[model samples]
Target: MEQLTKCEVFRELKDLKGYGGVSLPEWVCTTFHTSGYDTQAIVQNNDSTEYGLFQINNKIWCKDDQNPHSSNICNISCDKFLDDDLTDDIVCVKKILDKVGINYWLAHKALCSEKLDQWLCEK
Candidate 1:
């Protein structure tokens, strides 16, 4: 599995600084809490499976054979979320973030929304 460091994640999400009115620190924070930076992370849930560093739900965001009812909002295969590259994953996450706000992630509500600066990395 390709796991990224906090600094690496920080860099990866820098361009999205104000996307959805969410800062990069919040993005990095949510990423850590969501999937521990593992590019290949996957979580099976009741009628849904989450994938990638964002733990994006297959039920509504991506295609998953196990979840035939998936809306596939991201219009991409769930397998794409497991790859090392963050390009496609980032694109999908932006859509999710834009639509649902930061609350889309339970971890953000539980740990990241407040004091998100704590997740920032050293320059």
Candidate 2:
């Protein structure tokens, strides 16, 4: 909360009230615990597209790029994310959250499965 304000992500604690409803911070913290990471660290690594206290992925928010920091472009109008306009600063944390959600159990279940094989042929 303090860090978010310091970083200008939010003006005040109340500013996050509507993020995920009444339990936004709680959701983030819970997800962090489930992922075995520090909540502050997770939120601090957020990019423009991969938003929220949980770092949703660049693919969910922006496009891919040869340079990591060049992935996940942030658009102010949509107030959401896309996969095309990415930047290198876009971190991997967002990708994890985007695919898995902010629940530890859900994230763990997803982690156990293989990466999405979108280009693979069906057997």
Candidate 3:
């Protein structure tokens, strides 16, 4: 597992500003802090799905073909999520933020509620 530091993720989050409008710096950073700024990250939530840096759910937000029933809300291939370019990850996560609240990510509350920095100043 490649671990991304706060500065690394913070730099990337800069491009994703609104992170879906209500996107707070701490919130976004918190996500990257908890999840990953990783391009090669992937995982399963014991749900037969869930993959990528953002751990996007293939059953609902992405498609894997083998998962066939994927709603693919992102309409993107699950492979795209694992490719390292977080453009798709950011896009899909934005949708999730729009549909749900920031708290939907879970890690934010636990990891970001305090001391969220550690990754903000590469200056």
Model 2, span 19-98: residue lDDT tens:
32323344333334342332223222434333333344443344434225433433222213222222321233333334
Model 1: which residue pairs collide? none
Worst 10 residues of 2 by lDDT: 2-11
C-alpha-based local distance difference test score of model 2: 0.33
Question: What is the C-alpha lDDT profile of model 3 across 14-122, one tens digit per residue?
Answer: 5566655534556556657545656556666666566665667777888887788788888888888776567767888887777776776677777766764553565
TM-score of 1: 0.90
lDDT (0 to 1) per candidate: 0.85, 0.33, 0.67
> Best candidate, lDDT-wise?
1
Residue 119 of model 2, lDDT score:
15
Clash pairs, candidate 3, are 6-119, 39-84
TM-score result, candidate 2: 0.28
Assess every candidate by TM-score: 0.90, 0.28, 0.78
Q: Which is better, 2 or 3, measured by TM-score?
A: 3
Off by over 4 Å in 1: none
Better of 1 and 3 by lDDT: 1
What shift in Å separates residue 100 of candidate 2 from its native position after superposition? 12
